[PDB]
Design a protein around this nucleic acid. Structure first.
Lengths: 204, 137, 108, 190, 174, 72, 244, 62
RNA sequence: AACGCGACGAUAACCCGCACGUAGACGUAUAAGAAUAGGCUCCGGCCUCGUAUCCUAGCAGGCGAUUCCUCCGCCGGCCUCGAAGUGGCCGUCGGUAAUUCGCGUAUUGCAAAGACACGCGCGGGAUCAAAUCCUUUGCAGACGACUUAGAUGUG
């Protein structure tokens, strides 16, 4: 609750694009460094045909002359879609907006430097906590794949390997929990009942 | 003819179910008004857990596992108090895990500065015992 | 070795000035203090001393640290954001900058 | 109107093994195992008596109770498939060019392949890959008739429709050219 | 329309030498306060009969407190709202502990489902259903059904809007 | 239709001030014309049947009529 | 003109980039995917046509055919690429000792005035029992890489040209497991590879070159990177036969 | 005339690929790989078997 | 992408002089996955709540004991990490309130310019390894530009 961090890692699975992007933009303007993972696992409300229709309209938007300067560059990567949303909500043409954009980083999948780190979630943007059970929803990764994103399979195998390594890490964490709890009991067997009652009384 | 179903076992709202308000008190449901609002009353002698008879929103209400066995619908304050004392709602609430968390939170909040320093020292000692034990194991 | 902290202040962020939609007033600044999100917490933090610390790239008193002082005066809105008045208005590029709220004067 | 509660019941016979872990209805019977994920709908499953499963909705709409009805029917079809199984007697007719049908077990992927030749004399050979779990045989009781037997109603019906659709006449008078392969009988194995 | 109060308002025509001692007419008005209650009273009197504010006086205004605020009970309300086409009669049922609460839920439902405003709604009558089986509407009779016990699936827990970042993913089983 | 794959020309919802002003003037003219036609010139629904005490209300109405006859 | 080939751009590199290799499956046996030669010229052949259903079936047909002089190419390196959410990327490359003078001329630009120092420390690293580092690089390629390419160079000193700088190119190894293809490349180091080895008789291939710049009589007309598809090798000649 | 990207022509091309050119190219590549093989055969850390380190726009400066 | 990225090869280290030392750290500690009409588990049981865990005492953190073998850190070996590359174990060495003491802190007054070392730098000198200019070539060329070849040689 109102906590300041060196950097906040947000796991993008199950988050609404607009709400999560708006929260990230406000945090950037506040000065909190934000990084977002699983942009391919981000979610958009409505139906997938509506999503395809709007982003195909965006593709239809082009400059008349050579599409190299001043023309809308259609980035088909899900991370770049999230970046486009946040950029639209950021005053990108000002120095403050440029600073916020530099404070923001977005990625696809979870590279090792952030897979060996903790991921936070935003309750105000969670699909489960926000959308009605009967409503339909679509996947940014599926949209990007069917519009032109080329590396859905790459992130698929990399994510699967990360899953295997994380499962091994959890198994070793189970073993650590075993040892920790057994140590708790064994030490509490001779833990100076006076100090133990002191901890009990003070609430720890 | 073997059936294996693992679904979610929610708590049912019914006449006799006691709920915990956001103010930390308890109230048994006397009758259900709508699918979002109920009528509830806690005739608890304890001032902290006392709740006046009135409308409770199920959005602001949290369902506790304790339930009054056979509380009649529309039971007025005297009957509800009789059922409360007979079933020992206060004692079972004290035994409930949620009340343990509430007491721990209140007591942590009531810790003072010198109490915090003593917690520092005493946790360091207790930690010392465990730290060794963990190597042994 | 102590191996502990020396912090005697509460962290905050200078965010912006007292502004409408197209008119800003640099004389007063908006501060988001960490951990406080309600008007009661803002009321507790009312009347407080505030320091903005920055580097200078030149030593004047043997140090490059410069401090601009001010005070948290009255709360802003309902989210726990507070309003502050300094001797000199905070620069402008300190929008989103770390600020120190002291624990004095104390009413405890 | 936001109905508070509604329930439906599905009776199970004495010789099945039904299991729903999260929403993966897996039914086990003499012929095999049928698993279907029902994660797209909100239903509460319970065992309301010794051999009847109660599927319920709480605080749902008319669309939700309609979903309850249709999922009840699908579960009943799975029960029927694992108890008796489904048979589709398929018939083919020709006027002057006899249609040749050959069914072969493609060992890899373990699947049937049905090849149709001399359909209105076209030299093309129409090869159709067969649904997993369902078996195709050339009936010996009647002539110009095939039998499609399986456990999954959806699979067997989709395969029969695939055959009846691949054997379709183009740019010819349907009133005169009557050739094709058509569904004749739909029933249970037992 | 707001926290309403039921007012018994009695008014009368001003006394005259030709016609002293008028008939002292009375009404029940659901209004936020006494001034609105009197305005509604004079509107209804001038709409029905010739008596007007300039030629009349309000001799009494009183509050009608609900007899048993601590009892949940069933109300039937007969209403005549005016739409683009014309006046249409309806009878709607509600479940509340007080007449003012029933009228408030009535106004909310009317605005939500038929876009009927306070100026367009005329509260013809409100009655407490003395005995069961006088319920005709399914959305009340379902609550009136015997031994009602239902769960509350998919409860979104109250997480403070000021706690932007959560370490653990919420659960919706409470 | 292939609107899903090939969207068409969008219909702008950004209203122009000129169009807004024209609509305002013409609607005002419509109101004046309605008033002009009205000046030129050339049934109660009853108690609902589903009301639980309509019979009681009818009895009260008849009794009130009887009292009116007695008074007059 | 065609919009897929405009605006008319000069070929950035005189050699010609391959861009795309055939898709890999592990089931086939190991093989290189590319080779290089030099366009010598064309001649005329007459052929007994064996095209059933053709008007000129079993008749003399006169055709024009390009000759590409193809000296044996030398394997001098292996490279290991890794697949990433940003595409393929060079993970690590291993070189060979005793690199040729001509490949060194490729590594240099002003060869006449430069003391020949390139890859000297690399050869030293091979020589002084840093085979630890060598096997480390090879094990990295076998463990982390999915695509391997062999660096091969063609030899002007055998071609009949005034040139003296060799020609280098990366050639993918397909048809096998990563360990198998890395071992195959490791065997390939320091051995000439013939066109009889790379390609074979009467087969359809693709050819990459830079089409001539028509200079000195709206802009660049000529000198364009072109990969012409579907050209059929009819013959492979041996040089030493003298009955080619 | 049917387009070069028509579904029917694609299916016929796939059938031709799997039934006709398949075995021919298979035998071709078999003899080619055979000749390739003919030409080709013609402490953990201290030894290098264990992969070690050789010789940042992903993480924020610390 | 001429202001996107990777792998590799080859370099620039010495002599003399002289010039200076944060779009926002202050504990900037915390990796299962997956579902939300279910999940976790130690298999006992547990789940609204990160309102948690870890850490948190000593001159901006000294000295000596008391006494502990607990953590931290540096280097080696063993392996490990490749999506934009690291951690574990073992070993050495150094430090180390878990316990309990005696010494010093002040008058900075009730809050607001010395030496040494390490680097980034410039002005010259000479040192590599190269590039460009020059000549030649002509698979190239509006002019730039591009392919070559010039130091011993299949020049």
């Amino acid at each position: 609750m109102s906590s300041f961090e060196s950097v906040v890692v947000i796991d993008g699975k199950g988050h609404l694009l607009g709400r999560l992007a708006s929260i990230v933009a406000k945090q950037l303007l506040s000065g909190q460094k934000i990084v977002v993972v699983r942009c391919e696992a981000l979610n958009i409300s409505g139906e997938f045909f509506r999503a395809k229709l709007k982003y195909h309209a965006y593709l239809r938007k082009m400059t008349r002359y050579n599409p190299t300067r001043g023309g809308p560059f259609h980035f088909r990567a899900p991370s770049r879609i999230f970046y486009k949303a946040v950029r639209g909500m950021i005053p990108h043409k000002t120095a403050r907006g440029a600073a916020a954009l530099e404070r923001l980083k977005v990625f696809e999948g979870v590279p090792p430097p952030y897979d060996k780190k903790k991921k936070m979630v935003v309750p105000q943007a969670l699909r489960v906590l926000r959308l009605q059970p009967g409503r339909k929803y679509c996947t940014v990764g599926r949209l990007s794949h069917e519009v032109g994103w080329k590396y859905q399979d790459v992130v698929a195998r990399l994510e699967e390997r990360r899953k295997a390594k994380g499962a091994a890490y959890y198994e070793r964490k189970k073993l650590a929990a075993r040892q920790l709890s057994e140590a708790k009991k064994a030490a509490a067997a001779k833990v100076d009942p006076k100090v133990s009652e002191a901890l009990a009384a003070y609430g720890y | 003819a073997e059936i294996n179903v693992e679904a979610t076992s929610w708590r049912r709202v019914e006449v006799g179910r006691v709920l915990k308000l956001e103010n930390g008190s308890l109230a048994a449901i006397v009758e259900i008004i709508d699918h979002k609002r109920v009528l509830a009353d806690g005739p608890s002698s304890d001032p902290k857990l006392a709740t006046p008879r009135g409308i409770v929103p199920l959005s602001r209400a949290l369902l506790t596992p304790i339930v009054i066995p056979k509380l009649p619908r529309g039971a007025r304050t005297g009957a509800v108090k009789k059922a409360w004392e007979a079933y020992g709602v206060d004692a079972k609430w004290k035994e409930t895990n949620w009340a343990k968390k509430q007491l721990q939170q209140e007591r942590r909040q009531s810790l003072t500065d010198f109490d915090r320093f003593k917690v520092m020292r005493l946790k360091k000692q207790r930690r010392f015992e465990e730290r060794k034990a963990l190597a042994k194991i | 070795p102590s191996e502990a902290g020396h912090r005697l202040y509460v962290k905050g962020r200078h965010l912006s000035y007292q502004r409408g939609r197209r008119n800003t007033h640099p004389k007063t600044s908006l501060i988001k203090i960490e951990g406080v999100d309600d008007t009661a917490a803002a009321n507790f933090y009312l009347g407080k001393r505030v320091a903005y610390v920055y580097r200078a790239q030149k030593e004047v008193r043997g140090t490059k640290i410069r401090v601009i002082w001010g005070k948290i005066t009255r709360p802003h809105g309902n989210s726990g954001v507070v309003r502050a008045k300094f001797t000199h208005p905070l620069p402008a590029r300190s929008f989103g900058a770390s600020v120190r709220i002291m624990l004095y004067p104390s009413s405890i | 109107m936001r109905y508070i509660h509604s329930e439906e019941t599905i009776p199970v016979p004495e010789n099945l093994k039904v299991s729903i872990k999260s929403r993966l209805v897996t039914v086990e019977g003499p012929r095999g195992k049928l698993q279907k994920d029902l994660s797209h709908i909100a239903v509460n499953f319970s065992v309301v008596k010794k051999g009847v499963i109660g599927l319920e909705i709480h605080h749902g709409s008319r669309k939700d109770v309609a979903a309850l009805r249709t999922v009840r029917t699908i579960i009943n079809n799975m029960i029927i498939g694992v108890t008796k199984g489904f048979k589709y007697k398929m018939r083919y007719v020709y006027a002057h060019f006899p249609i040749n049908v050959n069914v072969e077990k493609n060992a890899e992927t373990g699947c049937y392949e049905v090849e149709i030749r001399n359909f209105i004399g076209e030299k093309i050979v129409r090869k159709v890959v067969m649904a997993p779990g369902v078996e195709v045989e050339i009936s010996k009781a009647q002539k110009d008739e095939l039998i499609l037997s399986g456990n999954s109603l959806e699979a067997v019906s989709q395969s029969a429709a695939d055959i009846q659709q691949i054997c379709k006449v183009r740019n010819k008078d349907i009133r005169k050219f009557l050739d094709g392969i058509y569904v004749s009988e739909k029933g249970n194995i037992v | 329309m707001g926290r309403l109060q039921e007012y018994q308002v009695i008014g009368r025509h001003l006394p005259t030498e030709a016609n002293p001692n008028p008939a002292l007419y009375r009404m029940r008005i659901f209004a936020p306060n006494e001034v609105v209650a009197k305005s509604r009273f004079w509107y209804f009197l001038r709409g029905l009969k010739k008596v007007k504010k300039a030629t009349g006086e309000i001799v009494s205004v009183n509050v009608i407190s609900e007899k048993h605020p601590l009892k949940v009970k069933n109300f039937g309300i007969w209403l005549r709202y005016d739409s683009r086409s014309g006046t249409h009669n309806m009878y709607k049922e509600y479940r509340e502990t007080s007449r003012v609460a029933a009228v408030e839920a009535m106004y909310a439902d009317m605005a939500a489902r038929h876009r009927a405003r306070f100026r367009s709604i005329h509260i013809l009558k409100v009655v407490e259903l003395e005995k069961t089986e006088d319920v005709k509407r399914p959305y009340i009779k379902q609550l009136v059904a015997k031994n009602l016990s239902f769960p509350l699936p998919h409860r979104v827990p109250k997480i403070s809007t000021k706690k932007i970042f959560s370490a653990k993913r919420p659960s919706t089983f409470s | 239709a292939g609107t899903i794959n090939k969207p068409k020309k969008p219909t702008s919802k950004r209203k122009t001030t000129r169009l807004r002003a024209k609509i305002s003037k013409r609607a005002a003219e419509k109101k004046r014309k309605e008033r002009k036609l009205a000046r030129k010139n050339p049934k109660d629904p009853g108690i609902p049947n589903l009301f639980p005490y309509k019979e009681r209300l009818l009895q009260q109405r008849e009794e009130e009529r009887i009292r009116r006859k007695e008074e007059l | 003109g065609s919009l897929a080939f405009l605006p008319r751009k000069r070929a950035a590199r005189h050699r010609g980039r391959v861009k795309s290799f055939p898709k890999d499956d592990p089931k086939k046996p190991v093989h290189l995917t590319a080779a290089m030669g030099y366009k010598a010229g064309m001649t005329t052949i007459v052929r007994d046509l064996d095209r059933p259903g053709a008007k000129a079936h079993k008749k003399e047909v006169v055709e024009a055919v390009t000759i590409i002089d193809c000296p044996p190419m030398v394997v001098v390196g292996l490279v290991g690429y890794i697949e990433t959410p940003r595409g393929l990327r060079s993970l690590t490359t291993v070189w060979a000792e005793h690199l040729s003078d001509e490949v060194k001329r490729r590594f240099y630009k002003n060869w006449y005035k430069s003391k020949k120092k390139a890859f000297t420390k690399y050869a030293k690293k091979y020589a002084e029992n840093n085979g630890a580092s060598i096997t480390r690089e090879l094990e990295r390629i076998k463990k982390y890489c999915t695509v391997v390419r062999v660096l091969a160079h063609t030899q002007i000193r055998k071609t009949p040209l005034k040139q003296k700088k060799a020609h280098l190119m990366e050639i993918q190894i397909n048809g096998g497991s990563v360990a198998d293809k890395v071992e195959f490349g490791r065997s390939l180091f320091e051995k000439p590879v013939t066109i009889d080895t790379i390609f074979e008789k009467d087969e359809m291939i693709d050819v990459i070159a830079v089409t001539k710049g028509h200079g000195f009589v709206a802009g660049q007309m000529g000198y364009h990177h072109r990969t012409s598809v579907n050209h059929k090798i009819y013959r492979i000649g041996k040089g030493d036969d003298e009955a080619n | 005339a049917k387009s070069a990207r028509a579904s029917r022509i694609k299916e016929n091309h796939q059938r031709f690929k799997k039934n006709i050119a398949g075995p021919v190219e298979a035998a071709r590549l078999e003899r080619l790989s055979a000749k390739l093989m003919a030409i080709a055969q013609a402490s953990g850390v201290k030894s290098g078997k264990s992969i070690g380190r050789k010789d940042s726009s992903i993480v924020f400066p610390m």
